[model samples]
Target: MKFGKNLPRNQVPEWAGSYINYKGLKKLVKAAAESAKDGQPVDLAEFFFALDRNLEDVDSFYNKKFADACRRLKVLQDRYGTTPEVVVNLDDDEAEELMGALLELRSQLRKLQWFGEINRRGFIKITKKLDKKVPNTTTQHRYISTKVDPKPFAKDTTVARILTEINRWISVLGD
Candidate 1:
């Protein structure tokens, strides 16, 4: 089965096969593939919107999901300390690409964190305090906090399980 354009509907993984029939989805997928073929960033929002899904909702979901994935990766890295042998299956370039994606995801997560806070609080505040002996310009501070649950992705998680199934389908690309 082809992984991208012209992928057989019957051969497509169940998780993604349902979306194959959605209006404009196939065209969007083909456009993204063409863009990627020309070394362009794939605008996934276009595809999501083409399928009649809200882009903001999809963005929020993925932002949170990737944020959680980053947290889990941090826990693993802290425990294992970046052992080279752990990623032996992937070559140096692939490993670097993966790490690059991880870093990009982390940066995006941070922006989302701040965006959430500002949205919740309306506006952020900054304060300056000076003691009798301290210089007036030296003491300024701002603080914000939000509750977050750093749950690791489990095999049963919706995104993980669905992606796993999609990956199984993509694995046949070399056939």
Candidate 2:
């Protein structure tokens, strides 16, 4: 499967660990019980280290970006609250702030979405890799929300509201 051109897996924000860990799963099948070094014991602890690294990477980035988005969104929302009945003829400074925050939010949504994608792959791959060892680690299931998967796609209506109002003002200008 030349996966480079095709969208192989579902990339939803809510999907905890569902990015087609196809390759990792393959490794699992390959390294099945009989493939072991029959004379030697194997250690599967690398999975733990990988798991923690993945979580820290996801959580730290997610928390900071999310906080920034929240901060900017609230600023815009406050600016939006003060818009007059005509809705805008905003002062130059106010317009600058509005436009700047608006543009940043649009870009930030994409950033969060992109982050979810690659990190999702990391999880799916690592989980399957763990199972590759002895196939006993179904524990990946509970590590999702409880263990802090990198979140993406809030689908914020606040942004929608911001867009709608901005569009309305554009309509005013056109008229």
Candidate 3:
């Protein structure tokens, strides 16, 4: 379907490998249909297990990335900030270092956003394909039950404060 056309292209190019193997899932679903027709009855439970791994992988990545970014932010705060809220006056001693740190944090935050959203969409697409090609009872129900409903970064957390601080420092670091 047309979904295949843009699916590969829409992925973040450098981070594409970490994205869901949507192509693999789609093909396996088709392969499941074929196997069902031939009557050998290949079960996709193992391949489906891979989805759990994908969820955990994404979760692990966000947790680590958040910690790394926090540490990065902390180092900068310790060096440049006298308090939690203030970035000191600069003398061009580390011209691009400040820009380098803050700007890269900005981009990482974006990629983290991209990462979560891309996987969520991929999960939905797989769900739809399974619904279309396979039986409605077990696979679909299992998908609903076991699927990782990944929490947003700021879901009842201080990502909001972390990000607000990031933006404040970024603004001071820039101009």
Candidate 4:
């Protein structure tokens, strides 16, 4: 199996599939990793909103359900005209663009989800569970622990954040 960037060949999970999908997923993961590596605050707040799913269950449900939700949003908008009263309110044009982006976003997310499931399944050919056990040594647990300085940046969040912000802007502008 081909490996994604930043992930070692030996470390690439069996479920990562072709380089095309893995490469796209890697781009998204790298964007997230860059924020973490730069010691910037990761704004995963809009993660739920973008995927229309919860964080705890997203890993499992992201592939199909999220895509379905986005598709449903478009279908509803098409059947009903620019109804802001509905749950996922969007104008005609906005809804169309959202559907398009959602299609691409879901394609990326499904690949990422595949990688995550593979990692969790220990399909990387590891005999031991990666995150199931405790650390070799115990240390003070702090939520604010950091390996690098936290620099403030406007796009410190995930693609979800950026997308949600764009939606918010469209809503405010009455688009």
Q: Give the Cα lDDT of each candidate.
A: 0.38, 0.51, 0.66, 0.37
- Runs of candidate 4 with Cα error greater than 4 angstroms are 1-89, 123-125, 128-175
Instruction: Give each model a TM-score.
Output: 0.25, 0.54, 0.75, 0.25
Model 1 error, position 131 (Å) = 30
Of 3 and 4, the candidate ranking higher by lDDT = 3
Which 10-residue window in model 1 sums to the lowest lDDT? 123-132
Task: Kindly report which residue pairs in candidate 2 clash with one another.
Answer: none
**Model 1, position 1: C-alpha lDDT score:** 21
> What tens-digit string does per-residue lDDT give for candidate 4 at 55-112?
1232343334445545655664576444334425656786666556545544444444
lDDT of 2 by residue, 1-175 (tens): 2232232343434433433344444444344444454634444454455455556656556656667767776776676664423335666676666566555576665555555555565565555445545544465556554554434422223434555555554454334
Tens-place lDDT digits, model 1, residues 89-175: 566675565566445544444433433332222111111111112223221222112111221211114444434433332332212
Error at 115, model 3, angstroms: 0.6
Residue-by-residue lDDT tens digits, candidate 3, 11-73: 767777777777777777887767767866678776577766766676676677778777877
Best-fitting candidate, scored by TM-score: 3
Clashes of 2: 0
Superposition TM-score, candidate 4 onto the true structure: 0.25
Q: Which regions in candidate 1 have their CA more than 4 angstroms from the true location?
A: 1-86, 123-175
Question: Which predicted model would earn the best lDDT?
Answer: 3
Residue 19, model 1: lDDT of: 24
- Evaluated against the true structure, the overall lDDT of model 4 is 0.37
